[PDB]
């Protein structure tokens, strides 16, 4: 039973509002925020998930950071709105890692807010609003669409993220590491998000070249685009006979293909996904902050871990172990990447016990050479 919103399909451009952008940033600021905007002096992390900011006026704001699945219902949003109305004057915030923050201007409200949040659970038993994600621990996982919405993934996002957070949960609620550890996940090498610049990155990979739908190559795709989309120039135009019919199609040099899947992004006739072939790689040692060392890219340390829905045990076990040895060895303030670099990647491999395979050696173009070892300086 159709319900118009006032939109007139007959006059599509009538009453059309455009270029209004989002609501101005300061529109929904809590009063204490708006008043003390740009006049903060210092802050304290009262405990995992709780912060306090002190303004020049003496005014204080308390922040309670809570975990969230990112992918959420309007039912859940409404519940948070209820909580916000109860303790925060109807105000709330989302972080850059998709955690939720509730702010109050007094200690008593803070105490009631936290006790309430900590008590809520989903029927299935999981915590609705676990408090934490602060300081030197493991916060939320920056992630993507996976099998929930994307056509190019090689793994899921929501599933593995839940499986990982369950495994490292204690670190979401405590600050016991040498430095914060950022975990990000992406379902394909497009690396939407932050995997390429995180302490620990999980990326979905393929291990087989794409299949070629010859009947549709020249119909559905712009062949020259597919040719220009290959980082290794494995894609080339070709002609193939089919049922007394010659067609313009594509040829792929399997030996030159590294299954990036980019040709499929450009051409629907080049499907690549594979249940058994698909898996995940683990990259470690990236960072975006300029603190102490310059920002770093994460490096591939595990060439392949198979998809094991719905819990991805191998993935999670491996991630937990990496955090364990990093935590037991790194200096205070030392990011995972800084630690691995200081000790030498060969010591990172021996301490972690991770296997070093031929896959880990860069072979992509001229820059690959600079990743090799031009020195006798190395530990046995």
């Amino acid at each position: 039973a159709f319900i118009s919103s006032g939109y007139n399909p007959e006059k599509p451009m009538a009453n059309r509002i455009t270029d209004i952008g989002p609501r101005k940033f300061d529109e929904f600021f809590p009063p204490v925020i708006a008043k003390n905007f740009g006049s903060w002096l210092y802050h304290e992390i009262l405990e995992p998930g709780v912060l306090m900011h002190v303004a020049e006026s003496g005014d204080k704001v308390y922040t309670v950071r809570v975990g969230a699945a990112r992918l959420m219902s309007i039912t859940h949003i409404r519940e948070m709105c209820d909580i916000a109305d109860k303790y925060c004057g109807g105000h709330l915030r989302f972080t850059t890692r998709n955690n939720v923050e509730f702010m109050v201007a007094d200690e008593a409200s803070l105490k009631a807010l936290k006790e309430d949040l900590a008590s809520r659970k989903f029927d299935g038993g999981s915590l609705k609003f676990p408090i934490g994600g602060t300081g030197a621990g493991v916060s939320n996982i920056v992630h993507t669409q996976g099998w929930v919405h994307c056509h190019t993934p090689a793994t899921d996002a929501s599933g593995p993220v839940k499986a990982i957070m369950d495994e490292v949960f204690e670190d979401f609620q405590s600050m016991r590491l040498p430095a914060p550890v950022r975990i990000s996940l992406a379902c394909c090498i497009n690396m939407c998000g932050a995997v390429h610049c995180s302490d620990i990155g999980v990326v979905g990979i393929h291990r087989k070249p794409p299949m070629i739908d010859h009947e549709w190559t020249d119909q559905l795709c712009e062949i020259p685009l597919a040719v220009a989309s290959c980082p290794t120039a494995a894609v080339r135009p070709t002609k193939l006979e089919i049922g007394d019919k010659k067609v313009n199609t594509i040829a792929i040099k399997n030996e030159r293909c590294m299954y990036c899947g980019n040709c499929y992004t450009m051409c629907p006739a080049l499907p690549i996904s594979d249940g058994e072939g698909d898996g995940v790689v683990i990259m470690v040692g990236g960072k975006v902050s300029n603190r102490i060392s310059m920002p770093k890219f994460s490096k591939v340390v595990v060439a392949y871990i198979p998809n094991e829905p719905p819990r991805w045990p191998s993935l999670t076990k491996t991630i937990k172990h990496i955090i364990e040895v990093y935590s037991a060895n790194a200096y205070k303030y030392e990011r995972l990447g800084e630690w691995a670099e200081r000790i030498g990647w060969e010591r990172f491999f021996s301490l972690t016990g991770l296997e070093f395979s031929h896959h880990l050696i860069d072979d992509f173009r001229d820059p690959a050479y600079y990743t090799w070892r031009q020195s006798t300086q190395f530990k046995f």
Partner: protein
């Protein structure tokens, strides 16, 4: 898949022709309304003709800046003619392959 004035058209969920060769002037008339167009002016035809010429000659859709330069129609003008844009609008009506990548 879709029928119009006795003509049968093989199309996708987005309403794009699966084959450039299956295109005919009648496809334009059938699609226009869905693309916010009532009358196909000469400026519409100019844009459609260009896309078709470029595709037949190059095997690819021209870049937006190329469409504008060859056509003389600035982007604003293009959107006035084709409300949904050069991709969803003009390319669909011209019979070119559906735009791909992260749109």
């Amino acid at each position: 898949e879709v029928t119009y004035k006795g003509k049968s058209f093989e199309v996708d969920e987005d309403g794009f022709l699966l084959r450039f060769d299956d295109w005919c002037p009648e496809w334009v008339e059938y699609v226009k309304e869905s693309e916010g167009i009532s009358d196909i002016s000469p400026d519409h035809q100019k844009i459609i003709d260009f896309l078709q010429d470029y595709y037949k000659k190059n095997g690819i859709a021209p870049m937006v800046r190329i469409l504008s330069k060859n056509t003389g129609f600035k982007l604003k003008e293009v959107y006035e003619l084709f409300p949904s844009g050069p991709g969803k609008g003009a390319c669909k009506m011209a019979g070119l392959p559906k735009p791909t990548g992260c749109v």
